[PDB]
Design a protein around this ligand. Sequence first.
Ligand SMILES: Nc1ncnc2c1ncn2[C@@H]1O[C@H](CN(CCc2c[nH]c3ccccc23)CC[C@H](N)C(=O)O)[C@@H](O)[C@H]1O
Ligand SMILES: Nc1ncnc2c1ncn2[C@@H]1O[C@H](CN(CCc2c[nH]c3ccccc23)CC[C@H](N)C(=O)O)[C@@H](O)[C@H]1O
Ligand SMILES: Nc1ncnc2c1ncn2[C@@H]1O[C@H](CN(CCc2c[nH]c3ccccc23)CC[C@H](N)C(=O)O)[C@@H](O)[C@H]1O
Lengths: 244, 244, 243
Amino acid sequence: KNRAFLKWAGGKYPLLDDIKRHLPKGECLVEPFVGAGSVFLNTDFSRYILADINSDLISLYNIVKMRTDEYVQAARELFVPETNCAEVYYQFREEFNKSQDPFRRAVLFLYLNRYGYNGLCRYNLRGEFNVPFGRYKKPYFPEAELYHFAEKAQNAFFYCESYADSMARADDASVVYCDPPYAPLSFTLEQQAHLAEIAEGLVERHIPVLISNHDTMLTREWYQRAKLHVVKVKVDELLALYKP
Amino acid sequence: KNRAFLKWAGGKYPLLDDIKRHLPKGECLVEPFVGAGSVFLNTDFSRYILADINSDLISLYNIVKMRTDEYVQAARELFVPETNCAEVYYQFREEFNKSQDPFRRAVLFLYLNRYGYNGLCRYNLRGEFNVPFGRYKKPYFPEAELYHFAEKAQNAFFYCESYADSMARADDASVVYCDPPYAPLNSFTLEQQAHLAEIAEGLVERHIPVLISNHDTMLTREWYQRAKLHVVKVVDELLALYKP
Amino acid sequence: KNRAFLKWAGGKYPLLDDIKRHLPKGECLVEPFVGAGSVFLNTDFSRYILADINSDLISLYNIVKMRTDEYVQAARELFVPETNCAEVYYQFREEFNKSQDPFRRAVLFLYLNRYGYNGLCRYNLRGEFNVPFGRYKKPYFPEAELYHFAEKAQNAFFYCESYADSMARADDASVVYCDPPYAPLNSFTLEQQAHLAEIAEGLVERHIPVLISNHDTMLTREWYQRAKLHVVKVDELLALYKP
Ligand SMILES: Nc1ncnc2c1ncn2[C@@H]1O[C@H](CN(CCc2c[nH]c3ccccc23)CC[C@H](N)C(=O)O)[C@@H](O)[C@H]1O
Ligand SMILES: Nc1ncnc2c1ncn2[C@@H]1O[C@H](CN(CCc2c[nH]c3ccccc23)CC[C@H](N)C(=O)O)[C@@H](O)[C@H]1O
Ligand SMILES: Nc1ncnc2c1ncn2[C@@H]1O[C@H](CN(CCc2c[nH]c3ccccc23)CC[C@H](N)C(=O)O)[C@@H](O)[C@H]1O
């Protein structure tokens, strides 16, 4: 059970067990929607292509991979409890939105993930990071998980681009896994259907794919050519396998 | 208690009785929203005017009335093991959507209702039927219900018109039951919901008795303010009686 | 707990204790959203300034303060049992909408609050009172609560005004308590929500304390970010601006 250094108070590491059963095997894993990394951190492919639209995330991750120690040392400073209050939370948020420094930004970013309302990552229309304070007991600085990430990252490349572009990188030796933002009970319905159409194209070329989403009509409509598996846990959750 | 041969799931049979209790006696029963026909099939009127805006439904019903065996024989062929899978379902759905033959359509329509998600009936903006494959196994061919429907049908006419047309056909020996699409907590608007109440008013003014069912709601209470109201538990169902 | 003569979407007074726990003290309490009065009616301030945009609410309250006995006599008539059917509710609703006499309108307003569905107060687009018949067994004529409200109104002013004007009457002796329409999970817009917190900030700077209640959500912690925050059992939030 390997933890992500970033919180997703989605709390979405239970699926992992069913994800791993259903996920085929291969040399490379492409993740067009990497987010916090849990699939990557709990699998053993020999390489990884890891992609996301969020350039803060990708920048952060290149920095953890290539500037490990300087980063880890710099970031821990920010976990002393002088910083566990609103006034300095709001102080850091502003610095972040003002900053032009990739490194300092990555550093503060981890703070806002951890002291932030629900570990949410959101932006306003103006592009400013938008989430408020979370008033959590005492946040844990994820030192161990940082080093794990960085070690495992030596077999990964990270890109900042949209699912369609990362999905074109896949090859006969690849396997794609997709965790798009969830279906209804910003990421449009036409994009959700475009993702399935791209997955259909990749089986025709012998490249396996597996997608996660909620269980709904919409979801079953888009994934109609996949083997479906329903997963229990708070409505159910679907996993759509496209196998050759 | 006789079952409909069309499954519905929502409004699935469960408050008949409460309707029977309040539904006045008469020579003829007018239903402007037959839908699946449950009331019609659990009621002993001398005759029936049964209507609905869904042209595929009314055509299926006419066919079942006039070609009973040719129909049961043909529809049975689709309720074998071979067909209980996504692959064939999307095949049948596309055939339906392309077909111009009423008989074949009406055969496929019943398959579609029993194998599709929740037995919904739904169309996209091009008028294509667009419910996806349903989850359950264990297909049931409704032979008995189909024959009972045909028998009962010799005392009915089926029209494909909208509520105001079919309600105008009611007379002094007639009784109207309305099961409009539900009120909220393409489709059937608020103006029509209030419209249906007026016609109902017109009708009792003429000594024709009308019964309407719906949700118990602020909005529902406002529209049916001139009926005697009855609340029934299972949210809450309202029944509104306009007695002369 | 002293009860309100009006039903407030069948008000439960669930926050009363905590509002009182956190509400600072002063000579005067300013309520920019009085609604039904529960905070007014459960506190011991030397003066109150009480305001709402709803003009039927404010006209009623002034009548109950000024012409008490005449009010209760005229209103009690509408609670006899001959009055508790749909035919009469709709006749009275119609009469209310067509009336131009404020006193008659206030008498009909209480009948509607007590005989109408879930005791809502709502208007359609023509500005007519919109709520249907609630069909209750036996509504309770709130005579005691009426008299209680009038005694207490003797130390109160009522204003028909939006939150920004009521809030600018506060002074260094005042305490301001805000119960705006709830944040999401016609309308009072989100611009207004942020606007209110920003007026709050202006006041705590001039040394006047302010306390705001709303649902606890992402948007409301953003809006009240310079307040001290108390959570309460969705969840409920009180925001306190302390000097
Ligand atoms: N068009 C896109 N192409 C590729 N990635 C995209 C696209 N649009 C949105 N995304 C990304 O997809 C990722 C979504 N992930 C968001 C996870 C997340 C929550 N808090 C976080 C903090 C940091 C990083 C990730 C998360 C997956 C969401 C989850 N699967 C869900 O089902 O709701 C985000 O990082 C988005 O940036
Ligand atoms: N203007 C209209 N005039 C007549 N009928 C109308 C009109 N508008 C809609 N309808 C029909 O009204 C019937 C609706 N009824 C539903 C029937 C139905 C749902 N799924 C089905 C599957 C097969 C057959 C019938 C149904 C009302 C159901 C319930 N009260 C609800 O709101 O869920 C449908 O058959 C529609 O076709
Ligand atoms: N812009 C405004 N300025 C001042 N007051 C306003 C403004 N906008 C709305 N209001 C008033 O704010 C009050 C709202 N309150 C509810 C109204 C109410 C309850 N019982 C009643 C009986 C009669 C009339 C109104 C109420 C409290 C808000 C609560 N948290 C909720 O969302 O349910 C009403 O009196 C409104 O008229």
